[PDB]
């Protein structure tokens, strides 16, 4: 994606999903016998996800006005929005679209839970 | 199964009961193999282990594979790492829950907590998908009001909610079915319902054309015709 | 499981707060309800003694008033059910419903066999003028001569909690003219006194029935809300127990994982 970003085009990258990447890193690190952390995840998973997340940007006109946009996906288990990986990724991301199973079965689809959802860029991104 | 698929050229039907134990085996050897324990003691390699196992169970250009896998759920807690990893691999999932089985309704499939890729109208046709949508919505509405029911009784709801709850409690039982294998366990003859009859029956129930019947008529019977027959049999 | 018990806890707690606030509100309104009941009973009882001097005796019109305000016990519907049974046992009658809850209950039992439009009254305690106006409107569309048999269906407080439906017939104007057992009473046939006494009787009986039903309804809603608070407390306690057990279990899993990590 950075090729499109740096050459003045616009690209959006979707990760489906970063939690399984973290699980793969947990396996890899544990078999390297690095010390475990919370919930047996390795001690630098935040430094993992942040390195991926920070690459999203819109470049200034000094570098051709290109942009890379990220839309990662997280599979929370049992609604544990406070879990280690969800907590870190929430701390990292600009805004969160929360999807609630209860609304989905209630026929409201695509079931975005508006009250919990947040966007920081907000009004600057919408068309007038 | 793979040799039959790739060499004989036949389509094959593969049953695996129950695949969960595979992962559990990996746990047992994990400590003696010297791995650091993963979450709740599972082996670190769980994800790629199940991958190397189950990515082999797939249709290919050389032949079709239809497979049914059943997973034991420790403590009936679906959040356990093994079933949670397993969800990613299945095209269709139908959770069985003690919540309905303890009430004695069988086969006790959870009509809310299940999914399939073929649900969309592009496959079943709109007339089927709409009935599916309204069935799920009705059951979910009943569940959402069930908390209040406990405190204010069935009389407290408005007419719309009360009628919706009546429809929901009818439907929830109408999903029950006497399996041919289950005769031993139930004394009820087995009933097999074709898909079109099922869609028609649930559309009929939602459209109010069979509203008046007591709940007991829907329980352990297949097809609306046999529901009517049981209604008459219970009236006698 | 943990989050499910948390959400159901939140729902139960919300409903319980509603129950407690409504409990205090109904407890406050009950006193004025009772005082108005006593006044109406005294007045209509004097009227009833004046009738007793006559030794009163008997499509028929039945008027039943149940407060439109919901959140009460089943009693509001139950009386509507009881009269419905009385309707079944006497198909010659005609039914009139004076309230929203009774209107809903009757609509499920006899939507079009007989029609009498009444609504919007249950927002406040009864008053003599309201009952008189409602009575004048009630017989206006169906002459009393077309309904010589009459019935009024009300609720009475068997106790602070207990409630009991009952009724008292409206003595028709034709019946008031027949002077059954009233031979000793002073009369003047030149006057409208029969019809005037009919209309006054209908107004006073409407007032008495409304007052009795209203006091019984307020008492019933208070008692029902107390029972609701009881059930809500049981609900919250049980889910709280399951809540803390589940929390300890998950924390135990986390503890075990960190313990095994450290030892290696």
Q: Are residues C35 and C161 in the same domain?
A: yes
Radius of gyration of chain B (CA): 22
Query: How buried is B157 (Cβ within 10 angstroms: 0-12 exposed, 13-18 middle, 19+ buried)?
Result: middle
Q: Beta partners for A58?
A: A67
Q: Which residues in chain B are contacts of C15 at CB distance < 8 A? A: 147-148, 151-152
- Beta-carbon separation of C257 and A79 below 8 A: no
Residues of B in contact with A26 (CB under 8 A): 38, 44
- What burial class does residue B82 get, using C-beta atoms within 10 Å of its C-beta: 0-12 exposed, 13-18 middle, 19+ buried? buried
Strand, helix or coil for residue A12: strand
Query: What residue spans of chain C are helical by DSSP H?
Result: 2-52, 75-88, 100-107, 128-140, 173-177, 193-263
- Please answer whether residues B121 and B129 qualify as being in contact, where contact means their C-beta atoms are separated by less than 8 angstroms: yes
Are residue C192 and residue C237 in the same domain, yes or no? Answer: no
- C254 at interface of A, judged by CB pairs closer than 8 A: yes
The C-alpha atoms of residue C221 and residue B152 are separated, in whole angstroms, by 12
User: CB–CB of B198/B175 below 8 Å?
Assistant: no
For A33, the closest chain C residue by CA position comes to: C264
Smallest CA-to-CA distance from B177 within B187, B191, B198, B167 is with B191
Cα–Cα dist C201/B232, whole Å? 51
Check if the beta carbon of residue B19 is closer than 8 Å to that of residue B71. Answer: yes
Same domain, yes or no: C8 and C79: no
Residues C132 and C63 in one domain: yes
Q: What are phi and psi of C155, to 5 degrees?
A: -115, 145
Tell me: do C82 and C110 sit in the same domain.
Answer: yes
Host H or E run for residue C164: strand C163-167
Strand partners, C165: C155
Tell me the Ramachandran region of residue A107: left when phi exceeds 0, alpha when psi lies from -120 to 50, beta otherwise: left
Q: Which two tokens stand for residue B43?
A: 């082996």
Q: For residue C64, what are its two tokens?
A: 């039943």
Kindly report the number of other CB atoms within 10 A of residue C217's CB atom. 26
Shared domain for C152 and C215, answered yes or no, is: yes
In three state form, how does the secondary structure of C53-108 look? CCCCCCCEEEEECCCCCCCCCCHHHHHHHHHHHHHHCCCCEEEEECCHHHHHHHHC
Does residue C100 share a domain with residue C13? Answer: no
Tell me the shortest Cα–Cα distance from C145 to chain A, in angstroms: 56
With H, G, I as helix, E, B as strand and everything else as coil, classify residue C52. Answer: helix
- In angstroms, how far is CA B154 from the centroid of its own chain? 28
Q: Is some CB atom of chain B closer than 8 A to the CB atom of A39?
A: yes
Do C262 and C160 share a domain, yes or no?
Answer: no
Calculate the dihedral angle through the C-alpha atoms of B35, B41, B45, B51, rounding to the nearest 10 degrees.
Answer: 160
Please choose, from the candidates C154, C129, C163, the residue with its C-alpha nearest in 3D space to the C-alpha of residue C67.
C154
Three-class secondary structure assignment of chain B? CHHHHHHHCCCEEEEEECCHHHHHHHHHHHHHHCCCCCHHHCCCCHHHHHHHHHCCCCCECCECEEEEEECCCHHHCCCCHHHHHHHHHCCEEEEECHHHHCCCCCCCEEEEEEEEHHHCHHHHCHHHHHHHHHHHHHHHHHHHHHHHHHHHCHHHCCHHHHHHHHHHHHHHHHCCCCCCCCHHHHCCCCCCCCHHHHHHHHHHHHCCCCCCCCHHHHCCCCCHHHHHHHHHHHHC
Strand B65-70 to strand B12-17: parallel, antiparallel, or no bridges (unpaired)?
A: parallel
Do both C179 and C90 map to the same domain? Answer: yes
Experimental method: cryo-EM
Judging contacts by C-beta atoms under 8 Å, the chain A residues touching residue B44 are 26-27, 30-31
Interface with chain B: mutation pick from A24, A30, A85, highest number of B CBs within 10 Å: A30
- The closest of A44, A37, A45, A40 to A19, measured between CA atoms, is A45
How far apart, in whole angstroms, are the C-alpha atoms of residue C10 and residue B14?
46
C-alpha distance from C228 to closest chain B C-alpha (Å): 5
A120 catalytic, yes or no?
yes
Cβ C258 vs Cβ C35: under 8 Å: no
Burial A56-80 (b: 16+ CB within 10 A, else e): beeeeeeeeebbbebebebebbbbe
Contact A88, A73 (CB under 8 A): no
B26, B45 Cβ separation under 8 angstroms: yes
Chains with at least 3 CB pairs less than 8 angstroms from chain B: A, C
Closest CA to B23 of B39, B45, B55: B45
Q: Are C97 and C106 in contact (CB under 8 A)?
A: yes
Inspect the interface and report whether the beta carbons of C3 and A35 lie closer than 8 Å: no
Number of domains comprising chain C: 2
DSSP state of A112: B
CB–CB of C83/C171 below 8 Å?
no
Residues C182 and C254 both lie in one domain: no
Domain that holds residue C144: 25-224
CB C122 within 8 A of CB C99: yes
* Cβ <8 Å between A27 and B79: no
Structure resolution in Å?
4.0
Q: Are residues C215 and C240 in the same domain?
A: no
For residues C71 and C166, membership in a common domain is answered with yes
């Amino acid at each position: 994606g950075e090729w499109f970003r740096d050459n003045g085009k616009h690209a959006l990258i979707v990760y489906d999903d970063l939690s399984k990447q973290a699980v793969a890193y947990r396996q890899l690190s544990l078999l390297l016998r690095r010390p475990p952390g919370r919930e047996a995840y390795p001690g630098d998973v935040f430094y993992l996800h942040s390195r991926l997340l920070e690459r999203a940007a819109k470049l200034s006109e000094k570098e051709g006005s290109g942009s890379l946009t990220a839309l990662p996906v997280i599979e929370t288990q049992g609604g544990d929005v406070s879990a280690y990986i969800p907590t870190n990724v929430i701390s990292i991301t600009d805004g969160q679209i929360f999807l609630e199973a209860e609304l989905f079965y209630k026929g409201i689809r695509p079931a975005i839970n508006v009250g919990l959802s947040v966007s920081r860029v907000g009004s600057a991104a919408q068309v007038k | 199964a793979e040799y039959f698929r790739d060499e004989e050229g036949q389509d094959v039907l593969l049953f695996i009961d129950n695949i969960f134990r595979f992962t559990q085996a990996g746990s047992e050897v994990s400590a003696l193999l010297g791995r650091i324990p993963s979450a709740v003691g599972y082996q670190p390699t769980l994800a790629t282990d199940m991958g190397l196992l189950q990515e082999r169970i797939t249709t290919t250009k050389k032949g079709s594979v239809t497979s049914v896998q059943a997973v034991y759920v420790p403590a009936d807690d679906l959040t356990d790492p093994a079933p949670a990893t397993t969800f990613a691999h299945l095209d269709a999932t139908t959770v069985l829950s003690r919540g309905i089985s303890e009430l004695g309704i069988y086969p006790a499939v959870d009509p809310l907590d299940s999914k399939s890729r073929l649900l969309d109208a592009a496959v079943v046709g709109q007339e089927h998908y709409d009935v599916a949508s309204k069935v799920q919505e009705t059951l979910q509405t009943y569940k959402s009001l069930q908390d209040i029911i406990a405190i204010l009784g069935m009389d407290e709801l408005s007419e719309q909610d009360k009628l919706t709850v009546e429809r929901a409690r009818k439907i929830q039982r109408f999903l029950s079915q006497p399996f041919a294998v289950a005769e031993v366990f139930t004394g009820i003859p087995g009933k097999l319902v074709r898909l079109k009859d099922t869609v028609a029956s649930f559309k009929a129930v939602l459209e109010g054309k069979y509203d008046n019947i007591p709940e007991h008529a829907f329980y352990m019977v297949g097809g609306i015709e046999d529901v009517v027959a049981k209604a008459e049999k219970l009236a006698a | 499981t943990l989050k499910e018990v948390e959400m159901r806890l939140k729902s139960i707690k919300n409903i319980e707060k509603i129950t407690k606030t409504m409990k205090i509100v109904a407890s406050t309104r009950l006193s004025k309800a009772e005082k108005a009941k006593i006044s109406a009973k005294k007045m209509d009882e004097a009227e009833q003694l004046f009738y007793k001097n006559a030794e009163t005796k008997n499509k028929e019109l039945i008027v039943a008033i149940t407060s439109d305000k919901g959140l009460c016990g089943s009693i509001h519907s139950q009386l509507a059910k009881a009269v419905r049974r009385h309707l079944n046992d006497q198909p010659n009658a005609d039914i009139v419903t004076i309230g929203d809850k009774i209107k809903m209950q009757l609509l499920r039992t006899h939507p079009n066999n007989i029609k009498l439009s009444i609504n919007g009254i249950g927002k406040d305690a009864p008053t003599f003028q309201e009952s008189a106006l409602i009575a004048d409107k009630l017989l206006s569309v169906m002459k009393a001569g077309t309904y010589p048999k009459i019935s009024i269906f009300y609720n009475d407080p068997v106790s602070s909690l207990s409630f009991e439906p009952s009724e008292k017939p409206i003595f028709n104007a034709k019946t008031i003219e027949q002077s059954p057992s009233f031979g000793k009473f002073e009369i003047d046939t030149d006057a409208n006194v029969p019809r005037d006494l009919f209309e006054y009787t209908l107004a006073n009986q409407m007032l008495t029935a409304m007052a009795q039903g209203y006091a019984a309804e307020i008492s019933a809603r208070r008692n029902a809300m107390d029972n609701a608070s009881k059930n809500a407390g049981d609900m919250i306690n049980r889910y709280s127990i399951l809540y803390n057990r589940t929390r300890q279990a998950v924390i135990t899993n986390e503890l075990v994982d960190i313990i095994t990590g450290a030892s290696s």
